[PDB]
Amino acid sequence: MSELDQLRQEAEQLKNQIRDARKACADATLSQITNNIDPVGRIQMRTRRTLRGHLAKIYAMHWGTDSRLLLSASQDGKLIIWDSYTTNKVHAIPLRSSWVMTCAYAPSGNYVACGGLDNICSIYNLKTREGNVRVSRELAGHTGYLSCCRFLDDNQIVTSSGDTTCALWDIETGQQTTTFTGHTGDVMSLSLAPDTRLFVSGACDASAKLWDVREGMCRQTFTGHESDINAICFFPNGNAFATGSDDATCRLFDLRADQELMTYSHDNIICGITSVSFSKSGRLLLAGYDDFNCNVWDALKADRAGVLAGHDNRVSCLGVTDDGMAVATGSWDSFLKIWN
Amino acid sequence: MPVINIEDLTEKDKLKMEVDQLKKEVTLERMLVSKCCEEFRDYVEERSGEDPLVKGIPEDKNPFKELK
Amino acid sequence: EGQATHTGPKGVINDWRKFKLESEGCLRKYRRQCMQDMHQKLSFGPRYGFVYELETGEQFLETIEKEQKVTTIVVNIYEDGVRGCDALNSSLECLAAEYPMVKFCKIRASNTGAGDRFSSDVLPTLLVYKGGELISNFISVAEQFAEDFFAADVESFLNEYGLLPER
Ligand SMILES: [Gd]
Ligand SMILES: [Gd]
Ligand SMILES: [Gd]
Ligand SMILES: [Gd]
Ligand SMILES: [Gd]
Ligand SMILES: [Gd]
């Protein structure tokens, strides 16, 4: 007869070694060093625009690289490309599933994507104009819902799934070029690095994995949260990233250190974090909680710098522009708002 | 070292790969947190002063100005 | 709360489930029901209707501590003679009447228990609390509106910061 119990211990002992390698460089926390940096003034953003059109709860959204065109996927099975500046709808795409979990905007503006409980990543060409009937490509493969997707370019797009996997697809052929495996739990979110050679993903196994797109393998595995990581976001300079989990805390992990640099949490905050985004310079970190509230944290001082939307329990999702000019929030009442 | 992979692997096949990743990760050279925080703080501080959401946007330089 | 169930993928999943727990056409109905359920849980009974005057700092502190964890409290720190104040006090009176679920209060800076900390330079100072914590702080609020401003103005202003209920 065979046995795995031993093989299960080599894994724990190795994990143990890694822990000491990390504890060996954990001399100080970030707050310690920044104990002299001046805290930011109280951040109070105000609504500049209100986008009306969706007939249901907003599930996801994503800004366009021009920091003017944005997308929003709604429980109404509709995909909408807006013009934040005027509040006008440029496109409007009917979906087959009302259960869209994510949607992305290609950095070129030519294509748009989205996927949900349909386990399929659908891509739409905005130039050939498929707003009514056409759907360029339906990326089939995953055996689990599509939690997140982000374009690397016009013919390359990565996806994360509840099937425990991440995949790099070739849009033309529609073939799952690379498969990134390792997580032991459903993959919830992923984030691309600025140079697009690396990307990070968070799963329900409570770990963050750094993958190498070109080489297709896992570089490192981060851990600290004891609950699921629901959201993850790369830092502006690409040497770190943030994560939000069901444990009601945000963690700033640095790639070189291979371990968290700081944690953002408060006793009054008891909800899980499902959304995270950095301001342009990275001084600000926006967190979205499951109670539809949003906190603005000071990346350096680990203290709430403010509240976004004034705790009205109406924020279901959000996103910051490339030019750091504004923040968008989606809601369960079907409206999107822009804030400065 | 392949590319495409189906998920119909056995628990063992997964444990194997797992410990291998864990070994590679062990051989990873780590930088002192102390040195990483300094660099983080540096980047942020000298840039936060230009951050539109931190300092605020002059009304004339705001793209989402009161629409007229 | 614990595990997330209203937003992100997790929400899409629970929403789909709750759907069948009612499904067993049907889609649109559910869409409306989700929104209805929500306003209901966010709309609390109209208790107040007037702007209350606090005389001491101990009162300030006592009003935000012992308040329900769901009520929004708008406090106005002013001082007679100081331009804006009166206009603001007139507006708040009309607002308190229109948004009975929100608790509006006023107190003289001199009575705050923080003398010089509130000079007439930053006066008409509007503070907003909720769940015990400060959500907003507006120094020299009167600057947000024209010389002559009325209820409808302060409403439009507070609404664009997500501070007022019922839409
Ligand atoms: Gd502001
Ligand atoms: Gd306005
Ligand atoms: Gd879990
Ligand atoms: Gd410097
Ligand atoms: Gd520097
Ligand atoms: Gd009104």
XYZ file of C-alpha atoms and ligand atoms in Angstrom:
581
model
C 0.000 0.000 0.000
C 1.082 3.607 -0.675
C 1.131 6.738 1.522
C 0.861 10.488 1.231
C 0.951 11.581 4.888
C 4.752 11.850 4.781
C 4.742 13.782 1.528
C 2.294 16.084 3.335
C 4.935 16.774 5.973
C 7.778 17.682 3.639
C 5.458 20.433 2.462
C 4.869 21.744 5.967
C 8.528 21.576 6.932
C 9.524 23.441 3.785
C 6.836 26.033 4.449
C 8.366 26.193 7.895
C 11.825 26.881 6.488
C 10.420 29.658 4.307
C 8.814 31.187 7.410
C 12.149 31.505 9.172
C 13.845 32.880 6.073
C 11.167 35.570 6.195
C 11.224 36.114 9.947
C 14.982 36.537 9.445
C 14.524 39.746 7.496
C 11.522 41.076 9.399
C 13.457 43.679 11.397
C 10.853 46.456 11.185
C 7.405 47.528 9.991
C 6.640 50.329 7.563
C 4.777 52.472 10.115
C 7.928 52.538 12.231
C 9.961 54.189 9.459
C 7.173 56.593 8.514
C 6.586 57.691 12.086
C 7.698 61.171 10.975
C 5.966 61.522 7.605
C 3.155 64.070 7.684
C -0.259 62.371 7.484
C -2.327 63.385 4.471
C -5.118 65.892 5.009
C -8.573 64.401 5.377
C -9.499 63.027 1.950
C -12.990 64.097 0.891
C -13.925 63.373 -2.723
C -17.138 64.718 -4.263
C -19.440 63.453 -7.017
C -18.854 65.151 -10.347
C -20.821 62.816 -12.620
C -23.682 60.355 -12.335
C -24.050 57.662 -14.988
C -27.621 56.463 -15.628
C -28.613 53.558 -17.859
C -28.190 50.169 -16.205
C -31.361 48.590 -14.914
C -29.699 46.522 -12.209
C -26.940 46.058 -9.633
C -23.467 46.891 -10.987
C -21.019 43.999 -10.611
C -17.821 45.277 -12.188
C -16.251 48.141 -14.111
C -12.916 49.082 -15.638
C -11.452 52.380 -16.840
C -10.035 52.830 -20.314
C -6.387 53.887 -20.668
C -7.461 57.362 -21.859
C -8.942 57.928 -18.413
C -12.237 58.927 -20.006
C -13.945 55.806 -21.383
C -15.062 53.205 -18.842
C -16.974 49.915 -18.754
C -19.603 48.555 -16.420
C -21.109 45.079 -16.310
C -24.511 44.843 -14.661
C -26.879 42.210 -13.321
C -29.054 43.355 -16.206
C -26.852 41.360 -18.567
C -25.617 44.577 -20.135
C -22.123 45.872 -20.920
C -21.786 49.661 -21.233
C -18.986 51.851 -22.482
C -19.391 55.345 -21.077
C -17.934 58.770 -21.637
C -17.405 59.938 -18.039
C -16.800 63.479 -19.279
C -20.306 63.880 -20.753
C -22.141 60.938 -19.063
C -23.088 59.706 -22.529
C -23.163 56.054 -23.575
C -20.837 55.267 -26.461
C -21.638 51.562 -26.734
C -24.152 49.169 -25.153
C -23.676 45.418 -25.301
C -26.369 42.802 -24.490
C -24.955 39.801 -22.643
C -26.373 36.283 -22.409
C -25.753 35.866 -18.703
C -26.867 38.257 -15.996
C -24.128 36.757 -13.857
C -21.086 38.656 -15.064
C -18.336 38.664 -12.457
C -15.781 40.785 -14.296
C -15.091 42.886 -17.405
C -12.014 44.518 -18.934
C -10.994 47.198 -21.400
C -8.022 46.490 -23.677
C -5.307 49.163 -23.231
C -5.871 49.971 -26.910
C -9.555 50.603 -26.607
C -10.271 48.330 -29.539
C -11.645 45.415 -27.511
C -13.618 44.727 -24.347
C -14.121 41.532 -22.305
C -16.212 39.950 -19.539
C -17.065 36.604 -17.965
C -19.037 35.127 -15.090
C -20.807 31.955 -13.969
C -20.770 30.940 -17.642
C -17.142 29.843 -17.233
C -16.461 31.727 -20.471
C -14.403 34.810 -21.236
C -16.200 36.738 -23.958
C -14.355 39.308 -26.045
C -15.961 42.079 -28.105
C -14.357 44.131 -30.858
C -15.339 47.795 -30.572
C -13.907 48.713 -33.977
C -15.614 46.081 -36.158
C -18.591 47.221 -34.061
C -20.236 44.135 -32.511
C -22.516 46.097 -30.207
C -25.651 44.238 -31.341
C -25.043 40.626 -32.418
C -21.322 39.898 -32.782
C -19.017 38.401 -30.152
C -15.544 37.998 -31.678
C -14.348 35.201 -29.365
C -15.793 32.979 -26.636
C -12.827 31.629 -24.640
C -13.870 28.147 -23.525
C -11.723 25.978 -21.274
C -12.087 26.691 -17.580
C -14.170 24.313 -15.529
C -15.039 27.076 -13.093
C -16.502 30.582 -13.174
C -14.388 33.421 -14.592
C -13.563 35.692 -11.652
C -11.305 38.166 -13.403
C -9.690 39.052 -16.733
C -7.214 41.665 -17.966
C -5.740 42.284 -21.484
C -1.961 42.264 -22.011
C -2.563 43.541 -25.535
C -5.017 42.933 -28.392
C -4.194 39.238 -28.890
C -3.267 38.247 -25.337
C -5.534 38.080 -22.289
C -5.105 36.447 -18.882
C -7.941 34.953 -16.873
C -8.488 33.589 -13.377
C -11.136 31.019 -12.526
C -12.954 29.273 -9.720
C -11.446 26.105 -11.122
C -8.246 26.944 -9.229
C -6.530 28.102 -12.427
C -5.195 31.098 -14.366
C -4.693 31.116 -18.125
C -2.991 33.161 -20.828
C -5.047 33.020 -24.015
C -4.251 33.776 -27.651
C -7.243 35.833 -28.762
C -6.913 35.016 -32.471
C -6.744 31.218 -32.320
C -8.658 31.178 -29.038
C -6.282 28.607 -27.552
C -5.283 28.489 -23.889
C -1.577 29.224 -24.604
C -0.437 28.897 -21.000
C -1.952 27.459 -17.858
C -0.780 28.672 -14.493
C -1.501 26.107 -11.791
C -0.636 25.978 -8.111
C -3.402 27.549 -6.042
C -5.400 25.102 -3.956
C -8.499 27.283 -3.827
C -10.730 29.238 -6.212
C -8.869 32.129 -7.830
C -10.695 35.364 -7.024
C -8.722 38.205 -8.603
C -5.504 38.956 -10.523
C -3.465 42.086 -11.331
C -0.983 42.890 -14.131
C 2.372 44.557 -13.521
C 3.276 47.779 -15.373
C 5.833 46.089 -17.672
C 3.328 43.260 -18.244
C 5.948 40.519 -17.795
C 4.534 39.500 -14.419
C 1.124 39.336 -12.788
C -0.220 38.384 -9.369
C -3.373 36.489 -8.366
C -5.261 35.908 -5.120
C -7.233 32.802 -4.188
C -9.396 31.118 -1.548
C -6.386 29.242 -0.226
C -5.305 32.513 1.373
C -2.186 32.988 -0.740
C -0.895 35.416 -3.339
C 1.116 33.975 -6.198
C 3.449 35.912 -8.489
C 3.480 34.370 -11.966
C 5.766 34.992 -14.920
C 3.726 35.455 -18.082
C 6.515 34.800 -20.564
C 7.829 31.718 -18.730
C 4.421 30.634 -17.423
C 5.519 29.477 -13.974
C 5.075 30.660 -10.359
C 7.913 32.800 -8.997
C 6.754 33.169 -5.381
C 3.843 32.453 -3.024
C 2.730 35.000 -0.442
C 0.823 34.278 2.767
C -0.362 36.192 5.815
C -4.135 36.290 5.623
C -5.964 33.445 7.332
C -8.998 33.953 5.103
C -9.643 34.209 1.371
C -8.007 36.913 -0.685
C -10.888 38.451 -2.662
C -9.055 41.343 -4.312
C -5.467 42.145 -5.301
C -3.797 45.158 -6.980
C -0.246 45.850 -8.168
C 1.605 48.872 -6.775
C 2.580 51.669 -9.231
C 6.329 50.887 -9.342
C 5.700 47.156 -9.739
C 7.788 46.157 -6.716
C 4.781 45.481 -4.488
C 1.030 44.939 -4.383
C -1.990 45.085 -2.077
C -4.516 42.425 -1.125
C -7.898 42.436 0.556
C -9.412 39.404 2.245
C -12.390 38.120 4.190
C -10.330 38.601 7.354
C -11.154 42.322 7.157
C -7.578 43.467 6.494
C -5.381 44.867 3.717
C -1.793 43.760 3.303
C 1.035 45.478 1.451
C 3.403 42.800 0.142
C 6.778 43.689 -1.363
C 8.216 41.393 -4.034
C 11.880 41.644 -3.059
C 11.155 41.068 0.623
C 8.832 38.182 -0.255
C 6.642 39.187 2.698
C 4.125 41.815 3.828
C 5.447 45.257 4.756
C 2.310 46.414 6.528
C -1.298 45.632 7.353
C -4.338 47.924 7.313
C -7.067 47.070 9.824
C -9.349 48.604 12.456
C -11.432 47.109 15.288
C -14.578 48.799 13.964
C -14.055 47.208 10.553
C -15.567 43.712 10.619
C -16.450 43.135 6.974
C -14.380 41.400 4.337
C -12.599 43.417 1.702
C -13.621 42.744 -1.871
C -12.012 45.653 -3.723
C -8.611 47.421 -3.671
C -7.031 50.229 -5.704
C -4.053 52.599 -5.487
C -4.052 56.326 -6.174
C -1.573 57.595 -8.770
C 1.467 58.077 -6.509
C 0.431 55.114 -4.380
C 0.083 57.207 -1.224
C -3.606 56.297 -1.142
C -5.218 52.856 -1.026
C -8.956 52.514 -1.541
C -10.718 49.499 -0.055
C -14.233 48.295 -0.756
C -16.008 46.239 1.875
C -18.870 43.735 1.586
C -21.219 46.144 3.430
C -21.033 48.483 0.419
C -18.706 50.884 2.171
C -15.374 52.308 1.110
C -12.382 53.430 3.181
C -9.447 55.504 1.933
C -6.230 54.399 3.619
C -2.854 56.151 3.901
C -0.429 53.649 2.352
C 2.366 55.021 4.513
C 0.798 55.739 7.910
C -1.692 52.861 8.175
C -4.517 55.125 9.349
C -7.798 55.944 7.606
C -7.248 59.120 5.629
C -10.922 59.235 4.821
C -14.177 57.700 3.624
C -15.218 57.486 -0.004
C -18.910 58.050 -0.755
C -19.520 58.873 2.919
C -20.486 55.405 4.237
C -23.869 55.275 2.455
C -23.732 51.502 1.875
C -23.994 52.061 -1.869
C -20.606 51.065 -3.301
C -20.397 47.648 -4.950
C -17.200 48.258 -6.935
C -14.685 50.951 -7.903
C -11.654 51.937 -9.978
C -9.026 54.657 -10.360
C -7.936 56.322 -13.637
C -4.436 55.960 -15.116
C -3.927 59.705 -14.786
C -5.118 59.460 -11.195
C -7.685 62.144 -11.967
C -10.761 60.365 -10.591
C -12.470 57.384 -8.932
C -15.524 55.545 -10.238
C -17.952 53.559 -8.093
C -20.645 51.159 -9.179
C -23.745 50.490 -7.102
C -26.553 48.077 -6.315
C -29.031 50.788 -7.226
C -27.776 50.651 -10.835
C -25.826 53.918 -10.820
C -22.162 54.753 -11.383
C -20.588 57.928 -10.049
C -17.306 59.670 -10.671
C -15.495 61.422 -7.769
C -12.715 64.101 -7.496
C 8.997 22.740 -18.186
C 5.686 22.840 -20.341
C 2.854 25.285 -21.040
C -0.716 23.911 -21.435
C -2.176 21.749 -18.678
C -5.523 20.170 -17.827
C -6.666 20.020 -14.189
C -7.356 16.282 -14.044
C -4.226 15.679 -11.935
C -4.173 13.322 -8.914
C -3.787 14.599 -5.343
C -0.237 13.222 -5.393
C 0.594 14.900 -8.711
C -0.466 18.130 -7.005
C 1.511 17.461 -3.813
C 4.597 16.680 -5.880
C 4.456 19.931 -7.841
C 3.666 21.734 -4.576
C 6.818 20.664 -2.757
C 8.859 21.401 -5.878
C 7.560 24.971 -5.952
C 8.302 25.121 -2.239
C 11.899 24.088 -2.802
C 12.452 26.603 -5.555
C 10.910 29.262 -3.311
C 13.260 28.313 -0.478
C 16.311 28.986 -2.646
C 14.917 32.486 -3.142
C 17.207 35.310 -1.971
C 15.313 37.832 0.161
C 15.949 41.540 0.774
C 15.623 43.114 4.240
C 12.168 44.530 4.899
C 14.047 47.439 6.413
C 15.529 48.250 2.978
C 12.239 47.799 1.116
C 10.242 50.165 3.359
C 12.819 52.895 2.809
C 12.386 52.600 -0.954
C 8.589 52.427 -0.696
C 8.449 55.507 1.552
C 10.835 57.282 -0.796
C 8.788 56.699 -3.974
C 5.476 57.608 -2.375
C 6.624 60.719 -0.517
C 8.277 62.470 -3.430
C 5.251 61.700 -5.608
C 2.284 62.110 -3.271
C 2.620 65.881 -3.627
C 1.614 65.647 -7.287
C -1.246 63.202 -6.618
C -4.566 64.752 -7.737
C -6.545 62.731 -5.190
C -4.171 63.660 -2.370
C -3.744 67.395 -2.864
C -6.989 68.021 -4.708
C -7.569 69.339 -8.231
C -7.606 73.056 -9.099
C -11.104 73.723 -10.469
C -9.768 74.843 -13.874
C -7.480 71.828 -14.181
C -10.317 69.392 -13.406
C -11.571 67.335 -16.406
C -14.815 66.637 -14.566
C -15.432 70.296 -13.795
C -19.015 71.480 -13.282
C -20.326 70.621 -16.748
C -21.315 73.688 -18.758
C -20.873 38.881 8.245
C -17.675 36.895 7.883
C -17.290 35.591 4.328
C -18.246 38.102 1.618
C -21.637 37.568 -0.034
C -22.788 40.877 -1.573
C -20.011 42.120 -3.810
C -17.339 40.875 -6.194
C -17.630 37.306 -7.595
C -18.808 36.023 -4.201
C -21.817 38.300 -4.596
C -22.567 37.166 -8.125
C -22.631 33.611 -6.768
C -24.841 34.222 -3.729
C -27.101 36.437 -5.859
C -27.499 33.569 -8.322
C -28.293 31.219 -5.461
C -30.789 33.440 -3.659
C -32.286 33.726 -7.160
C -33.221 30.015 -7.258
C -34.358 30.154 -3.627
C -37.154 32.213 -5.234
C -37.001 30.883 -8.804
C -38.048 27.300 -7.984
C -39.093 37.174 -16.613
C -37.991 35.607 -13.339
C -34.671 37.358 -13.889
C -36.007 40.909 -14.079
C -38.257 40.384 -11.047
C -35.220 39.322 -8.993
C -33.281 42.367 -10.184
C -35.958 44.668 -8.856
C -36.349 42.662 -5.630
C -32.644 43.038 -4.794
C -32.902 46.828 -5.016
C -36.175 46.930 -3.045
C -34.851 44.756 -0.247
C -31.955 47.194 0.029
C -33.699 50.564 0.301
C -35.878 48.948 2.928
C -32.934 47.995 5.131
C -31.384 51.431 4.692
C -34.578 53.360 5.371
C -35.067 53.727 9.110
C -38.026 55.241 10.902
C -38.222 59.090 11.020
C -37.454 59.913 14.673
C -36.475 63.580 14.686
C -37.430 66.646 12.673
C -35.782 69.555 14.481
C -32.266 70.965 14.896
C -31.228 70.330 18.463
C -29.079 72.764 20.415
C -26.217 71.363 22.497
C -24.813 73.657 25.216
C -21.668 71.814 26.329
C -18.937 69.579 24.959
C -20.072 66.747 27.204
C -23.363 66.926 25.302
C -21.661 66.804 21.900
C -19.795 63.633 22.929
C -22.962 62.161 24.459
C -25.016 62.637 21.307
C -22.594 60.785 19.015
C -21.819 57.974 21.500
C -25.310 56.910 22.564
C -26.767 57.230 19.070
C -27.889 54.172 17.084
C -25.114 52.678 14.963
C -27.044 53.504 11.791
C -28.025 57.136 12.323
C -26.198 59.968 10.575
C -25.606 63.024 12.756
C -24.929 66.455 11.281
C -23.414 68.870 13.782
C -23.030 72.565 13.096
C -20.438 74.524 15.060
C -21.108 78.245 14.783
C -21.066 81.603 16.552
C -23.595 84.459 16.174
C -22.615 87.483 14.123
C -20.310 85.354 11.978
C -21.444 85.600 8.359
C -22.974 82.451 6.907
C -24.004 80.967 10.257
C -27.539 82.282 10.172
C -28.133 81.244 6.581
C -26.810 77.797 7.453
C -29.007 77.581 10.556
C -32.066 78.500 8.491
C -31.312 75.793 5.961
C -30.612 73.113 8.541
C -34.003 73.815 10.090
C -35.714 73.095 6.789
C -33.537 70.019 6.176
C -34.096 68.487 9.585
C -37.790 68.732 8.782
C -37.319 66.937 5.440
C -34.929 64.187 6.621
C -36.358 63.068 9.972
C -34.059 59.971 10.084
C -31.002 62.260 10.261
C -30.154 63.979 13.533
C -29.209 67.672 13.096
C -27.496 69.685 15.880
C -25.913 73.089 16.515
C -23.489 74.402 19.136
C -21.528 77.621 19.681
C -17.792 77.252 19.175
C -17.441 78.957 22.552
C -19.480 76.118 24.060
C -17.534 73.322 22.327
C -14.813 73.313 24.953
C -12.173 74.113 22.345
C -11.863 77.889 22.340
C -9.250 79.152 19.891
C -9.378 75.843 17.996
C -12.440 77.252 16.233
C -11.724 80.820 15.138
C -14.275 82.701 13.015
C -11.881 82.179 10.125
C -13.011 78.501 9.838
C -16.358 78.961 11.494
C -19.584 77.689 9.936
C -17.921 74.297 10.519
C -20.084 71.302 9.665
C -19.201 67.918 11.168
C -20.843 64.629 10.163
C -20.865 61.452 12.252
C -22.209 57.940 11.778
C -21.669 54.743 13.746
C -19.658 56.686 16.298
C -16.998 57.769 13.824
C -16.537 61.090 12.033
C -17.363 60.737 8.339
C -17.014 64.343 7.179
C -15.525 67.627 8.310
C -16.246 70.823 6.389
C -14.338 73.914 7.502
C -15.912 77.223 6.419
C -18.936 75.441 4.919
C -20.499 78.705 3.773
C -17.745 78.894 1.157
C -19.357 75.988 -0.619
C -22.341 78.127 -1.568
C -23.171 81.581 -2.914
C -23.638 84.514 -0.523
C -27.341 83.816 -0.408
C -27.921 80.091 -0.109
C -30.910 78.062 1.006
C -31.968 74.599 2.167
C -31.989 73.224 -1.382
C -28.346 74.250 -1.723
C -26.989 72.637 1.431
C -28.967 69.551 0.413
C -27.387 69.337 -3.029
C -23.988 69.799 -1.387
C -24.371 67.137 1.312
C -25.914 64.760 -1.191
C -22.833 64.869 -3.422
C -20.705 63.557 -0.570
C -23.079 60.642 -0.009
C -24.190 61.985 3.342
C -27.982 62.029 3.014
C -30.398 58.993 2.904
C -33.345 58.069 0.651
C -31.647 58.365 -2.705
Gd -11.919 67.476 -1.872
Gd -22.611 69.602 -8.685
Gd -11.333 29.381 2.189
Gd 14.490 61.138 -2.132
Gd 13.760 58.747 -5.373
Gd -35.434 68.826 -1.078
